[PDB]
Design a protein around this ligand. Structure first.
Ligand SMILES: CC[C@H]1OC(=O)[C@H](C)[C@@H](O[C@H]2C[C@@](C)(OC)[C@@H](O)[C@H](C)O2)[C@H](C)[C@@H](O[C@@H]2O[C@H](C)C[C@H](N(C)C)[C@H]2O)[C@](C)(O)C[C@@H](C)C(=O)[C@H](C)[C@@H](O)[C@H]1C
Ligand code: HEM
Length: 391
């Protein structure tokens, strides 16, 4: 399998798999699914395709409060704890603050800067920290913890030792959040941690383990992908720069750009399930108790789903609930309205200040993530025209 960092090679490979081997078993006994229709089938059928990886990891037991790894009927009660925090009306109230953070961060940039260090990292981490009621002094901790997680040594995703390694890398974060949970129990505010520690799920409060693990999932979910998307947006516009001008003339076009970048370059290009029973996808027999890898990236480029799938085209009618890059079915991204707002406001503010940004391809800081996510660790950019220029 080509690594994430060589996008062209990876896309080439996925394309031949869609044609020649749409359901593929790898050397670890992991089963890969490449076509859009088949990815939807898998994601919709939660009884057959569990979100709990521990089923196939010997020695590992389910992680209490890990919403992303919990199946119906328990899933719905846990999601109901936080879903009201994430409604479009409630999220829309965050626009002024998102814009204030973005504008201030960009105002001090200069005309040559790393988009990630300046804005794509600090914006989403501030917004999710503020959602969870955590302090600014803790942002650097979160970036260190997400970075280590993203670069964890990893090959066979069913290895018991990988599960232990993840646990160890996230131990400091979960411990920190456990302390913050105990703190909010005593002195609640109206942040997300307060809501989760005071909630009653199926007749009782979440225990300390559950609440910390749920907090951990919310924190990680809330920044890594948003950071990656913003980078992917600027990098994709740089490859199709006629769109900078069009968005400057009509900023109403920015949400369509955001949707099309999501399709074209999903931050999270693959997700795993486990089979609860013997099943078949596209007539290919898959046994019980194995791990399944759904390639969102391959689904998004499938010509049966999207005409001329390798063309970047904001005029595509796709988006909303049909945005596969936010998942599909019961686990569909709780943060979607928020991700969409942060990225809309970021691009508006970039265009307002600079008109356009050019990616500096000769700057050595430009490096792709090698695994797990689809994007760049840093994106050195050059300003088109900035308020700093003078006679
Ligand atoms: C809450 C929803 C979000 O969920 C999370 O953020 C979870 C808390 C992470 O779970 C962690 C921690 C733990 C203890 O869970 C209880 C563990 O049992 C699982 C397996 O790993 C998440 C799944 C991570 O992904 C996984 O990493 C692993 C290191 C490798 C996995 N694969 C490639 C094999 C990969 O699939 C990661 C990095 O955070 C993905 C991020 C960046 C992402 O793009 C998606 C969109 C993410 O935001 C949502 C999915
Ligand atoms: C552009 C950025 C984002 C992308 C691409 C993205 C993507 C995804 C995807 C693909 C899933 C489903 C994973 C699966 O089915 O296993 C998911 C779930 C989730 N996301 Fe997002 N996300 C983004 C931003 C956010 C933000 C800002 C938040 C706010 C905290 C958030 C919170 C969550 C939560 C809590 C879940 C779990 C939902 C559940 O399991 O019921 N995400 N996300």
């Amino acid at each position: 399998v080509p690594g994430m960092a060589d996008e062209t090679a990876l896309l080439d490979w996925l394309g031949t798999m869609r044609e020649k081997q749409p359901v593929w078993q790898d050397r670890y006994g992991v089963w890969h699914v490449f076509r859009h229709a088949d990815v939807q089938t898998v994601l919709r059928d939660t009884a057959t395709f569990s979100s709990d990886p521990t089923r196939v990891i010997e020695g590992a037991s389910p992680t209490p409060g890990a919403i992303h790894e919990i199946d119906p009927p328990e899933h719905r009660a846990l999601r109901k704890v936080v879903s009201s925090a994430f409604t479009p009306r409630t999220i829309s109230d965050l626009e002024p603050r998102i814009r204030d953070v973005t504008r201030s961060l960009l105002a001090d940039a200069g005309e040559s800067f790393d988009l990630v260090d300046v804005l794509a990292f600090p914006l989403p981490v501030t917004i999710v920290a503020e959602l969870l009621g955590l302090p600014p002094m803790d942002h650097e901790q979160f970036g260190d913890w997400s970075g280590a997680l993203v670069d964890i040594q990893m090959d066979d995703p069913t290895d018991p030792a990988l599960a232990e390694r993840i646990a160890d890398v996230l131990n400091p974060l979960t411990a920190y959040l456990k302390a913050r949970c105990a703190e909010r129990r005593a002195d609640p505010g109206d942040d997300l941690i307060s809501r989760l520690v005071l909630a009653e799920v199926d007749g009782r409060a979440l225990d300390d383990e559950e609440a910390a693990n749920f907090s951990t999932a919310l924190l990680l979910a809330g920044h890594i992908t948003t950071t990656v998307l913003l980078g992917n947006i600027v990098r994709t516009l740089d490859e199709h720069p006629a769109h900078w001008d069009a968005a400057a003339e009509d900023p109403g076009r920015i949400p369509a750009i955001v949707e099309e970048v999501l399709r074209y370059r999903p931050p999270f290009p693959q997700m795993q399930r486990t089979t609860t029973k013997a099943t078949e996808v596209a007539g290919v027999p898959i046994p019980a108790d194995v791990m399944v890898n759904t390639w969102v990236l391959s689904a998004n480029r499938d010509s049966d789903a999207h005409d001329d799938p390798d063309r970047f085209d904001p005029s595509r009618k796709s988006g909303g609930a049909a945005q596969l890059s936010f998942g599909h079915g019961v686990h569909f991204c709780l943060g979607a309205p928020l991700a969409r707002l942060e990225n809309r406001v970021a691009l508006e503010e970039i265009i307002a200040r600079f008109g356009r940004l050019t990616v500096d391809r000769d700057d050595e800081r430009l490096r792709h993530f090698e695994q797990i996510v689809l994007g760049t660790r840093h994106l050195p950019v050059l300003a088109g025209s900035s308020p700093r220029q003078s006679a």
